[PDB]
Amino acid sequence: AHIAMFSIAAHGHVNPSLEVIRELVARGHRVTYAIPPVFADKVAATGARPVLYHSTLPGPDADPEAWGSTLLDNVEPFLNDAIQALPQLADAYADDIPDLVLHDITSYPARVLARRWGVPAVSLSPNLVAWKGYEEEVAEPMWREPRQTERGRAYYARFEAWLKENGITEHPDTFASHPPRSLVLIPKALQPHADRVDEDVYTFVGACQGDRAEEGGWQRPAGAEKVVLVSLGSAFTKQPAFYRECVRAFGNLPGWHLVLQIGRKVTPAELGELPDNVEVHDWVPQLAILRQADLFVTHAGAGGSQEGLATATPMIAVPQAVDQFGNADMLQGLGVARKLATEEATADLLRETALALVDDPEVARRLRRIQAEMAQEGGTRRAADLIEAELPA
Ligand SMILES: CC[C@H]1OC(=O)[C@H](C)[C@@H](O[C@H]2C[C@@](C)(OC)[C@@H](O)[C@H](C)O2)[C@H](C)[C@@H](O[C@@H]2O[C@H](C)C[C@H](N(C)C)[C@H]2O)[C@](C)(O)C[C@@H](C)C(=O)[C@H](C)[C@@H](O)[C@]1(C)O
Numbered sequence: 066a067h068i069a070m071f072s073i074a075a076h077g078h079v080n081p082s083l084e085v086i087r088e089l090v091a092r093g094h095r096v097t098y099a100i101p102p103v104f105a106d107k108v109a110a111t112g113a114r115p116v117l118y119h120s121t122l123p124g125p126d127a128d129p130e131a132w133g134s135t136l137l138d139n140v141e142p143f144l145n146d147a148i149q150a151l152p153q154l155a156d157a158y159a160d161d162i163p164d165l166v167l168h169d170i171t172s173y174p175a176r177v178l179a180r181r182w183g184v185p186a187v188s189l190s191p192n193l194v195a196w197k198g199y200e201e202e203v204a205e206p207m208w209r210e211p212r213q214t215e216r217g218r219a220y221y222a223r224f225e226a227w228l229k230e231n232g233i234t235e236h237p238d239t240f241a242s243h244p245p246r247s248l249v250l251i252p253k254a255l256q257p258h259a260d261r262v263d264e265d266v267y268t269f270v271g272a273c274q275g276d277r278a279e280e281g282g283w284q285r286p287a288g289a290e291k292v293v294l295v296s297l298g299s300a301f302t303k304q305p306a307f308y309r310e311c312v313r314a315f316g317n318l319p320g321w322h323l324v325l326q327i328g329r330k331v332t333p334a335e336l337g338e339l340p341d342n343v344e345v346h347d348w349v350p351q352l353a354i355l356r357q358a359d360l361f362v363t364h365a366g367a368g369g370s371q372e373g374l375a376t377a378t379p380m381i382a383v384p385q386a387v388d389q390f391g392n393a394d395m396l397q398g399l400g401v402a403r404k405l406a407t408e409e410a411t412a413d414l415l416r417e418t419a420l421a422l423v424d425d426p427e428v429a430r431r432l433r434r435i436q437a438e439m440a441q442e443g444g445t446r447r448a449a450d451l452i453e454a455e456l457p458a
């Protein structure tokens with residue numbers, strides 16, 4: 066019926082679920098989407114009707130450091146934003162109560178309002194979720210020393226008091242970290258402690274968009290036996306001492322063709338006369354390239370990691386920052402990748418690693434079983450089935 070999606074103005078919390086919104090609309094449901102004004106047009110592209118609230122969180126364009134760099138500086142803003150957001154949204158939906166509530170993990174008001182409405186809420190997570198064990202295993206030692214501070218005790222007391230005034234007796238950690246129903250938009254292959262996640266609460270549906278492969282008419286060179294892509298997303302990609310290191314590993318290496326990227330307009334020219342079997346770019350139809358590639362040197366960001374698995378492309382994971390270590394360790398543990406520190410990645414080690422991965426029927430054997438498992442996660446139309454299933458009679 067009336068499906069109301071909720072999120073914040075951050076690409077990583079809106080882009081993952083765009084196509085599922087689109088699908089429920091394409092079905093014939095009336096879908097509205099609570100969002101700050103900056104992303105009004107972004108969500109509107111999907112048929113969804115925007116519903117504009119004001120946010121106090123950093124803007125989508127704002128720097129990553131704007132979100133804080135301590136545990137309490139990371140979490141406090143989501144509560145403070147919720148407190149001022151909630152009464153805007155409660156107002157907005159009074160003259161049109163939605164039938165089902167959809168929401169990104171960051172929206173506390175969606176949780177509160179869904180309970181207020183007596184309607185199902187479905188949480189959409191663009192990253193890993195809690196497993197059975199998480200509170201004792203991970204949430205507790207994380208919170209022991211900060212919750213203990215006057216600052217931490219006060220944060221939790223405030224969170225509790227806000228919930229209680231809303232008729233919610235939930236402890237804030239269960240309210241925040243433990244949804245009653247969740248769809249997870251990463252492959253389960255990239256979820257730590259995968260068997261121990263609660264399937265009756267969480268269903269993994271993986272990426273939702275275009276595999277494969279979005280989208281630009283790339284062509285492997287006639288002659289190429291082994292194509293390698295180096296393509297570190299569109300963010301962590303301004304490294305002097307690395308691409309030139311990749312050129313040296315694969316440049317003039319018989320049989321291999323290197324698709325290399327950087328990101329200017331301009332400029333290929335910090336240096337390197339360059340071998341003939343190397344092509345450089347500012348940007349690529351990455352999914353499209355991986356669709357024929359035999360090897361992927363990746364920073365192991367969420368997208369790249371998903372895309373490598375989606376295309377059964379063995380990976381050299383060379384982690385660089387906050388998005389990466391665990392992802393690289395998991396790709397590692399799947400037996401489909403090698404983790405390298407930036408950084409010892411010598412030309413000889415990169416080459417040796419490359420060779421060691423592309424000629425392994427077993428590495429390929431693991432990647433094929435992963436794609437089969439991802440195909441069961443379905444994608445978009447699948448996420449809509451489950452959301453249609455929760456969308457009461
Ligand atoms: C498991 C279940 C928990 O998920 C997490 O632990 C994941 C694994 C964090 O990412 C991890 C991993 C990482 C890299 O974020 C991807 C890290 O930066 C943060 C601090 O923790 C998330 C998503 C963080 O979001 C990120 O916070 C950053 C400050 C800004 C970033 N974005 C808006 C720019 C945003 O996505 C952050 C703060 O926990 C979200 C707030 C709302 C929470 O406290 C919620 C309730 C979480 O505890 C949780 C959903 O229950």
Ligand SMILES: O=c1ccn([C@@H]2O[C@H](COP(=O)(O)OP(=O)(O)O)[C@@H](O)[C@H]2O)c(=O)[nH]1
Pocket residue numbers: 296297298299300301326347348349350351352365366367368369370372388
């Ligand atoms: O030159 C590029 C770089 C990035 N991407 C796409 O941009 C996304 C990058 O996301 P990821 O999580 O991998 O890295 P991030 O940039 O967020 O750190 C992925 O879907 C890539 O396929 C692309 O198509 N061409």
